[PDB]
Amino acid sequence: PQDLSEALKEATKEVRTQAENAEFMRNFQKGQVTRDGFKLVMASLYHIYVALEEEIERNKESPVFAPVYFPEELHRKAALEQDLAFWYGPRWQEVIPYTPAMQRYVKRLHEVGRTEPELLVAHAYTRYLGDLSGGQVLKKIAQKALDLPSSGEGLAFFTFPNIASATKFKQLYRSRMNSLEMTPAVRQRVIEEAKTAFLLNIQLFEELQELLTH
Amino acid sequence: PQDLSEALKEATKEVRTQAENAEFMRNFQKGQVTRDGFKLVMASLYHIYVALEEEIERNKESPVFAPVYFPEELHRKAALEQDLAFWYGPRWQEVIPYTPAMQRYVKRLHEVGRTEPELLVAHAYTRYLGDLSGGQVLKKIAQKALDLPSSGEGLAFFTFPNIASATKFKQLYRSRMNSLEMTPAVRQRVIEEAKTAFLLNIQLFEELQELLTH
Ligand code: HEM
Numbered sequence: 001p002q003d004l005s006e007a008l009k010e011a012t013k014e015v016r017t018q019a020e021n022a023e024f025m026r027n028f029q030k031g032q033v034t035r036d037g038f039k040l041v042m043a044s045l046y047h048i049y050v051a052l053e054e055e056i057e058r059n060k061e062s063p064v065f066a067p068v069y070f071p072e073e074l075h076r077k078a079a080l081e082q083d084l085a086f087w088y089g090p091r092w093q094e095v096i097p098y099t100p101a102m103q104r105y106v107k108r109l110h111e112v113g114r115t116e117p118e119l120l121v122a123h124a125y126t127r128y129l130g131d132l133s134g135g136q137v138l139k140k141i142a143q144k145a146l147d148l149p150s151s152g153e154g155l156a157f158f159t160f161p162n163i164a165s166a167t168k169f170k171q172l173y174r175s176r177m178n179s180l181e182m183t184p185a186v187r188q189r190v191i192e193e194a195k196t197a198f199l200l201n202i203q204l205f206e207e208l209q210e211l212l213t214h
Numbered sequence: 215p216q217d218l219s220e221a222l223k224e225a226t227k228e229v230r231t232q233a234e235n236a237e238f239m240r241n242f243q244k245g246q247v248t249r250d251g252f253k254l255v256m257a258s259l260y261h262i263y264v265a266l267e268e269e270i271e272r273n274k275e276s277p278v279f280a281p282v283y284f285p286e287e288l289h290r291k292a293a294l295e296q297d298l299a300f301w302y303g304p305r306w307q308e309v310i311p312y313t314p315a316m317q318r319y320v321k322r323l324h325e326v327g328r329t330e331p332e333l334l335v336a337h338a339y340t341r342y343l344g345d346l347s348g349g350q351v352l353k354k355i356a357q358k359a360l361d362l363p364s365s366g367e368g369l370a371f372f373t374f375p376n377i378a379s380a381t382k383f384k385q386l387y388r389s390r391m392n393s394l395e396m397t398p399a400v401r402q403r404v405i406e407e408a409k410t411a412f413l414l415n416i417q418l419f420e421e422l423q424e425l426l427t428h
Pocket residue numbers: 005008009016019020025026028029125126127129130131133134137138197198201
């Protein structure tokens with residue numbers, strides 16, 4: 001389609017289904033998820049969102065990203081910090097895993113930010129809009145399954161306190177995405193990078209699932 | 215005493231006891247606290263920490279604050295945002311109170327930041343170190359009392375995920391405070407401002423208590 005947002009949606013439909021039908025995620029959806037499992041994804045999200053947001057900050061003033069820069073509304077690093085402190089204790093920093101699939105994702109994010117900032121929007125879209133749209137569904141699953149203490153922390157990641165309405169925000173985001181001017185060369189690269197992002201996720205889930213069964 | 219940290223501790227002992235004597239806080243300590251009550255302090259903390267951190271950012275490079283600037287370790291705005299979203303729902307932004315005692319506190323903070331940045335450390339000390347040292351306790355009280363859902367959010371404020379050890383951090387903070395070079399003129403102004411900060415708190419508790427009994 002003409003609009004980037006639509007083109008991304010449709011171009012990635014295959015990999016997104018593959019991504020949502022990864023075993024780990026399938027079991028997540030069906031309600032089967034363990035504490036160790038949850039601790040792992042949260043640790044992954046941290047590494048990922050640290051890298052992503054590091055590179056967003058690097059390129060926030062560039063024309064190729066500035067229009068989709070919404071720091072207050074989207075930033076996840078902090079909430080992840082809050083959550084990991086809960087899940088892993090005060091020395092979470094030192095004791096959280098950093099598996100090869102996490103490195104591979106972190107690595108790509110940095111190579112994009114440093115040398116292809118024009119593609120960064122692919123990852124921003126993939127992650128933020130994804131987690132926004134599939135958050136609140138995951139979240140509910142997690143609390144029923146993980147049978148948590150009434151300690152009032154652990155799931156901050158699944159709430160974007162500065163976005164009153166998701167639907168309004170998604171539209172505004174898409175609008176801004178589609179405002180981005182780019183050559184057809186770049187546009188296809190961006191579409192591919194989005195597929196890449198889904199794969200990096202897919203392989204990460206395969207990796208986590210492998211670890212959890214051993 | 216010679217060291218600012220000690221001079222502040224001893225100079226404010228009266229007001230601090232008065233502050234911890236306040237009915238609202240007394241009832242908090244002895245376990246008696248309601249949802250409406252809790253929602254109110256959390257809303258206050260938001261307004262306060264927004265103003266404080268706004269002014270910290272304004273003056274972080276100044277000699278009169280830079281040495282006690284620990285953004286990652288201390289910042290509370292975000293966690294408060296997470297918590298209010300939980301306590302007040304997605305439109306917390308629009309529906310949280312902003313009473314006169316909150317305005318009075320917010321007002322002072324901005325007056326200090328804009329025209330007496332040298333005193334800002336009084337408020338930083340009062341708030342951050344206070345909440346740090348009294349946190350894990352108020353947290354526990356709050357969860358037993360408020361009987362909250364296992365929803366994994368609501369109490370992020372009471373956790374500083376980037377401070378592995380409180381005791382180590384308090385020392386480092388005090389060290390930095392005491393490093394700050396200032397004239398005796400300023401030093402007394404700072405000591406007074408700290409007393410001010412405690413009062414602003416005291417009056418706020420009196421105000422909240424008044425509201426809660428109608
Ligand atoms: C159990 C896991 C997941 C669930 C239950 C889930 C659920 C959903 C739901 C219900 C939507 C709404 C469809 C729409 O309005 O477009 C959605 C959209 C989306 N999800 Fe997921 N999702 C999951 C995992 C993922 C993952 C892992 C990613 C990416 C790494 C992702 C990326 C997206 C994106 C980008 C959209 C928006 C598509 C668009 O409108 O452009 N999701 N998700």
